[PDB]
């Protein structure tokens, strides 16, 4: 088959980096009247990405012609298409041509992905072209493609470069809303903003206190969204919050922001849906039915994690110590729900085995079936029982990326208990903080900005306190 032949010869070109043979074989196929499918086009886009930048080489600038033709042909793009299209646009380094690709996708009814907007946005950011960056941003907005931190930080940086205090403000609110805690680089960038001449010079001496007060009630708390307040130089300090969310520097008590229980039942349904896709339906169903018949619970334990975190092998001591300590902080002394592999319940010291059976008899242990991923079980139990989740799982794994970066991090902060162990004292339960670890804007315009960290028990979390000295 002549379509199946072109595949064999194109498969050779990508595994050699042979761009000129692919551009010859593309033209030969058009001579032969051979129609190119998804796979043919994706391989040519990838192969063209290997060319670098005298004037444009015929690998890159031909790559966009192949892209434009693929769209005209109405060959539906898959995820490899968007990726290769993006890395072609990255290697070219022409932001205006990157953005032209996205416009073509829009005109032909194709949803662009986040990585499609990157080369454009980041290109216009490097060149200091704020108006083009903002066009790209508005196009993302209308396409319903949600920016993550890198895109937001570029918009912030370009807004700082063009003295656009209004856009800095709006982008800072978008970081709060979407990201919550900022990477090191963004954090440094926000510090720079607050120390800058433009920030010193933008503000108001007098504003309507009630209009602010109503906005605070309106937004859920911890921000108002009405613009910069106060005047004069900002006092900008790197500081920390104490255990109660009091700023060490200015003594403001940070706010604790509620979760809307409607978002929670939505999240619960999404977990069920995501889990049923990956587990054997009847296994996850069986767990749901068992859970409806048991409880109430004050806490759910990731049994594998409590047995294995900081251990060379499974410590029943550590699991048992953790069960006992959760029971002890339960106002009515409920046993926590231990989720553990059936593999692990069957361990080899008889009194430990009998305790695992007693917890199961007490309605406080569920042995997950062989093949299952425990994570879905302990997630679904904690969410549905509206209780604490005791786990030190870092949650890097692909699974957790499916849960989203808005609701689930907020839920996690309110529900997650982690264990820490010292020589001196043994095992400690680290409880959810009595405040929200998020960018906050106070009623008089004081800002607290949390840096993001891998582990906030290992490393003490840096915050920025930006307060008007007048
Ligand atoms: C916040 C305010 C302040 O005046 C001050 C002074 C000395 C040392 C500090 O850390 C701070 C501070 O964090
Ligand atoms: C926010 C505020 C608060 O006082 C509190 C107290 C106990 C447990 C919590 O999770 C919270 C909270 O999230
Ligand atoms: O779509 C579903 C996946 C798993 C599951 O347990 C389930 C369910 O229990 C009820 C309706 C839908 C689903
Ligand atoms: Zn402060």
From Swiss-Prot:
Residues the record lists as binding Mn(2+) 1: 302, 374
PPR repeats by residue range: 2-36, 42-77, 78-112, 113-147
GO molecular function: metal ion binding; ribonuclease P activity
Residues that hold Mn(2+) 2 according to the record: 375, 393
Keyword Chloroplast: yes
Cofactor remark from the record: Binds 2 Mg(2+) or Mg(2+) ions per subunit.
Catalytic activity: Endonucleolytic cleavage of RNA, removing 5'-extranucleotides from tRNA precursor
Domain PRORP: 241-465
Keyword line: Chloroplast, Hydrolase, Magnesium, Manganese, Metal-binding, Mitochondrion, Nuclease, Plastid, Repeat, Transit peptide, tRNA processing, Zinc
Compartments (UniProt record): Mitochondrion; Plastid, Chloroplast
Single GO BP term: tRNA processing
Cofactor(s), names only, from the UniProt record: Mg(2+); Mn(2+)
Deletion phenotype: Embryo lethality when homozygous.
Gene Ontology cellular component annotations, sorted alphabetically: chloroplast; mitochondrion
Residues that hold Zn(2+) according to the record: 247, 250, 448, 465
EC code(s) of this entry: 3.1.26.5
Family from the record: Belongs to the PPR family. P subfamily.
Protein name: Proteinaceous RNase P 1, chloroplastic/mitochondrial
Lineage of the organism: Eukaryota, Viridiplantae, Streptophyta, Embryophyta, Tracheophyta
Interval of the full protein contained in this chain: 95 to 570 of 572
């Amino acid at each position: 088959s002549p379509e199946a032949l072109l595949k064999q010869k194109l498969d050779m070109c990508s595994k050699k980096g042979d761009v000129l043979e692919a551009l010859r074989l593309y033209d030969e196929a058009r001579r032969n009247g051979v129609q190119l499918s998804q796979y043919h086009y994706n391989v040519l886009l990838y192969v063209c990405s290997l060319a670098e930048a005298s004037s444009p080489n015929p690998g890159l600038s031909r790559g966009f012609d192949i892209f434009k033709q693929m769209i005209v042909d109405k060959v539906v793009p898959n995820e490899a298409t968007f990726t290769n299209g993006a890395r072609l646009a990255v290697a070219k380094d022409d932001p205006e041509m990157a953005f032209d690709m996205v416009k073509q996708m829009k005109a032909f009814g194709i949803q662009p992905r986040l990585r499609s907007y990157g080369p454009a946005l980041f290109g216009f950011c490097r060149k200091g072209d704020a108006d083009k960056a903002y066009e790209v941003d508005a196009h993302m907005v209308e396409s319903e493609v949600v920016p993550e931190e890198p895109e937001l930080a570029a918009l912030l940086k370009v807004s700082m470069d063009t003295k656009n205090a209004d856009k800095v403000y709006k982008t800072l609110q978008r970081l709060r809303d979407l990201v919550r805690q900022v990477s090191k680089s963004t954090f440094d960038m926000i510090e720079e903003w607050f120390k800058s001449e433009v920030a010193t010079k933008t503000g108001v001496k007098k504003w309507d206190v009630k209009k602010i007060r109503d906005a605070v009630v309106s937004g859920g708390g911890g921000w108002h969204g009405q613009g910069w307040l106060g005047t004069g130089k900002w006092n900008v300090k790197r500081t920390e919050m104490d255990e109660n969310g009091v700023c060490k520097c200015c003594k403001e008590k940070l706010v604790c922001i509620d979760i809307n229980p409607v978002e929670t039942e939505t999240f619960a349904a999404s977990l069920t849906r995501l889990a049923c896709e990956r587990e054997v339906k009847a296994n996850f169903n069986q767990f749901q039915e068992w859970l409806e018949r048991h409880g109430p619970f004050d806490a759910v334990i990731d049994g594998a994690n409590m047995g294995l975190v900081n251990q060379r092998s499974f410590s029943f001591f550590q699991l048992n110590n953790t069960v006992q300590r959760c029971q002890q902080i339960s106002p009515s002394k409920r046993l926590p729900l231990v989720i553990l592999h059936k593999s692990r319940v069957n361990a080899t010291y008889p009194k430990n085995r009998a305790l695992l059976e007693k917890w199961k008899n007490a309605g406080a242990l569920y042995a997950t079936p062989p093949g299952s991923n425990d994570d879905w079980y302990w997630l679904y139990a904690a969410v549905s029982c509206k209780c604490l989740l005791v786990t030190n799982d870092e949650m890097r794994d692909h699974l957790f990326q499916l849960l989203g970066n808005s609701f689930f991090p907020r839920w996690k902060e309110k529900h997650q208990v982690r264990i820490s162990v010292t020589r001196e004292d043994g095992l400690k339960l680290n409880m959810p903080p009595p405040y929200s670890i998020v960018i906050q804007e106070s009623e008089d315009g004081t800002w607290h900005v949390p840096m993001s960290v891998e582990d906030d028990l290992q490393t003490s979390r840096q915050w920025l306190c930006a307060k008007r000295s007048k």
